[PDB]
Design a protein around this ligand. Structure first.
Ligand SMILES: OC[C@H]1O[C@](O)(CO)[C@@H](O)[C@@H]1O
Ligand SMILES: OC[C@H]1O[C@](O)(CO)[C@@H](O)[C@@H]1O
Lengths: 480, 480
């Protein structure tokens, strides 16, 4: 009912298209950025704008026969904090008791001065509540070993040590930057009486995801599909991979030779690939992606691949596309609350729009927009909101495949034996629950330099085991 | 290194290759055969050499919320007979207690006169034995409802009626042909006191596989991957699909209109695709496939697609390739007992050969050949035996994809929505446990007319529920 608005939207959609040549370019550039990040660093790690390529100091892939007494685990992400108790039984089996809690809104507000003590004190309190609900008989007696999954870039110096490099995903607490997060958590655990709980391991949620699958993958399943990558596609995006110790040059030459002699071959690398091409040398960029990077983000100039892929930022891309279409007098925001409310449109809102149908007059879309920002719409308007949402998602999925394809190429994981395939472990609300995301990722892996022959050898498997099992495995190994 | 034997095998291997153009040819021919089989035929049902396309009289796909009292089930295949008790609880959950028993050898020999009563009398006893071990409290009191899974082509005329068309898996009881197998079973259940057990449903193991998955597939999974085909790739091969009631012209026109008025749209079709192209108008044919059809099979001229794919016949294909290579003085059978022992080499034998490696001097192959036919071998001989097994399997997998692609195309099941995907329920020892089968099937589906874009929208999923839940679902619906 408005040919101008119709053709204005069709033009915004075409900006988000990713071509096969762009996939190939970014795949080859990503590999080049991997090689740069694996070399010794030139300056402060918090200033590096390139692929961080952080060594995690995890050199042994679980077998599945590891066993021990109930370990503790703690996982701080970008939205929720969870604590669980995992009993590794061996033979690719385990028992888990877990409690999940949303990160209080107080920590995502600048009205008040938030500090590391405020956060880790709350984490230590949730830890106490979990030990009282599931192990009330021995809360203050056992010498619990805990693994801490920290879903944020860390300058890891050992399995138990590492300072935060920068906050990401809506978290801004300047106090923590540069602090061994294990100590911070331990200090608050000691102040509430849980000094008998020792945090023995620090892992990224990518590293943890890979370890968990290497353990639970049945001997039969693992023989065919070997887990090679631990991936995340939720509030943020990131992934890890095993790199040959000889190529990790940033590691001290003595440390490499000291590790190599011990019978080790590889070490996990937390790519932090949300910070891939932070200079925007090749990443697709629109006027709306710069608005998010510069005005509405907590970390301007960093995690730019993330700002085009992860679920924290996709819904915001739509808000800027719509506000820009009202500034042009093409779209009527009516009495909406979009203006001056960043991130009011979430990715969960867009999930109810990706697969809504016209035969229902796009009713789910209508209700989802009213619930999120009191925005009324007509059918013709919802038809075009869907065309935009579907374009924002496809670009996110197609870009989400570049780091996976690049890693597989560099490590030659696809040049295996007859009938052999690989497994990429993916956890996150986007890959898991967003309609069509995983399907579109594979379309890109087929368009990537590995071709459709490669996509069929890659098994994008959801890892609903959790990064706690991975950290639990890192705790069973380390000493109290 | 015999250049004679080396290139003699290389020629046998090249004969088994299936090209993209052949897949397209066989796919379109399969659809032509589907349309023919859905028209009314006047001739004898046991004489028709074309795609049977049997209406099953099942018009409702389970929802997953079905609930009821404990139902009974009975599943007769080509190797084992099992009886179980399934309690449908709803929410994609069920309780199952089952006892499994091998089909007595008395039925796998023609020395003695075997009759239908001999079979169903033994079945009725197994049922009684099961009801005494697991439901001893109300064996002769309860009004048990039973669903009968009969893994053989049946001229189904209702949910509870249908006459056997032909036997197909190594055992033949000519008495049964043309007899309502439900009645036969009921008479023997009543004659041993279990007249309180009423057989209320008759299903093929294909129909059961589809129904079971529609029930057990979580609502989330069901929304993503809709089950569209229930197929079998084990002792035999076959699959079912939902067909529009209007296209099933073979069904009485008036009966259709009465179903349509009741709110019905489709009905399951037991393709019986093992009998596809029994005239060999396009199916690949070798000197070894003719030897099996005419000399070693129980039903020469029937189930010819099956004789090139299913596991009852794959191992025999190797035995004839080996005997033909000794007749040419190219291969030394030594003191083997292959000769004059049909089916002595099973598909389980070939499974230990598909993925054996040279670094182990192909020891599994050596031991598997010695365990099956006292056939000694050398390393260079096993190198070529694997090339034969790998050629027999690839052709079997590539051919196994033709019926699936044809069905998906005919119903246009892959383009029904934006992010549309489907689920193909697969049960059977070959698809489930044979190394690489599913991997090679997907390679063929990508070469089929649905393209790699289509294969990525198809989910070849093993059906770990069993056809017992499916038959239980048909019994909970039917009346006592
Ligand atoms: O949680 C998702 C991902 O987001 C990051 O914070 C930044 O890329 C990573 O540390 C984490 O793995
Ligand atoms: O068991 C697998 C399949 O084999 C047949 O007996 C013949 O193709 C079918 O009746 C059955 O579904």
């Amino acid at each position: 009912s408005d040919p101008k608005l119709t053709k204005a939207v069709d033009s915004i959609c075409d900006q988000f298209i990713v071509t096969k040549s762009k996939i190939s370019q970014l795949t080859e550039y990503f590999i080049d950025c991997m090689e740069k990040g694996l070399e010794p660093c030139e300056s402060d790690i918090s200033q590096n704008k390139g692929l961080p390529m952080i060594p995690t100091f995890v050199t042994d892939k679980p077998s599945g026969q590891e066993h021990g007494v109930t370990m503790l685990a703690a996982d701080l992400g970008g939205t929720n904090f969870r604590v669980c108790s995992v009993e590794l039984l061996g033979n690719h089996e385990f028992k888990i008791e877990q409690e999940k809690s949303k990160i209080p809104t107080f920590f995502f507000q600048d009205d008040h001065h938030v500090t590391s003590k405020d956060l880790f004190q709350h984490m230590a309190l949730i830890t106490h509540q979990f030990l009282t609900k599931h192990h009330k008989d021995v809360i203050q007696d056992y010498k619990w070993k805990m693994g801490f999954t920290f879903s944020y870039p860390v300058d890891q110096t050992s399995l138990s040590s590492g300072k935060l490099i920068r906050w990401t995903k809506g978290f801004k607490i300047g106090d923590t930057v540069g602090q061994d997060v294990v100590q911070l958590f331990q200090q608050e655990l000691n102040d509430i009486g849980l000094s008998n709980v020792h945090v023995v391991a620090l892992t990224n949620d990518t590293t943890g995801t890979l370890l968990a699958r290497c353990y639970a993958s049945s001997d039969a399943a693992r023989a065919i599909n070997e887990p090679v990558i631990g991936c995340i596609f939720g509030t943020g995006t990131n992934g890890c991979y095993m790199e040959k110790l000889e190529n990790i040059h940033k590691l001290d030459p003595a440390s490499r030779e000291e590790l190599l002699s011990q019978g080790k071959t590889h070490m996990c690398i937390n790519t932090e690939w949300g910070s891939f091409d932070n200079e925007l040398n090749h990443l697709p960029t629109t006027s709306y992606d710069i608005k998010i990077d510069q005005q509405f983000s907590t970390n301007p100039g960093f995690q730019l691949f993330e700002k085009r892929v992860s679920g924290l930022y996709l819904g915001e891309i739509l808000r800027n596309i719509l506000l820009d279409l009202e500034k042009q007098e093409l779209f009527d925001l009516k009495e909406s609350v979009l203006k001056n409310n960043p991130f009011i449109l979430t990715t969960e809102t867009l999930s109810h729009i990706e697969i809504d149908t016209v035969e229902n007059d796009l009713q789910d879309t209508r209700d989802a927009l009213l619930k999120a920002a009191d925005l009324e719409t007509t059918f013709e308007e919802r038809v075009l909101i869907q065309k935009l949402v579907r374009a924002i998602s496809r670009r996110a999925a197609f870009l989400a495949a570049v780091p996976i394809a690049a890693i597989l190429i560099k490590t030659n994981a696809l040049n295996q034996s007859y009938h052999c395939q690989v497994e990429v472990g993916c956890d996150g609300s986007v890959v898991e629950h967003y309609p069509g995301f995983r399907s579109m990722m594979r379309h890109a892996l087929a368009l990537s330099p590995i071709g459709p022959e490669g996509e069929r050898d890659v098994h994008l498997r959801i890892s609903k085991d959790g990064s706690g099992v991975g950290a639990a495995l890192c705790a069973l190994h380390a000493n109290y």
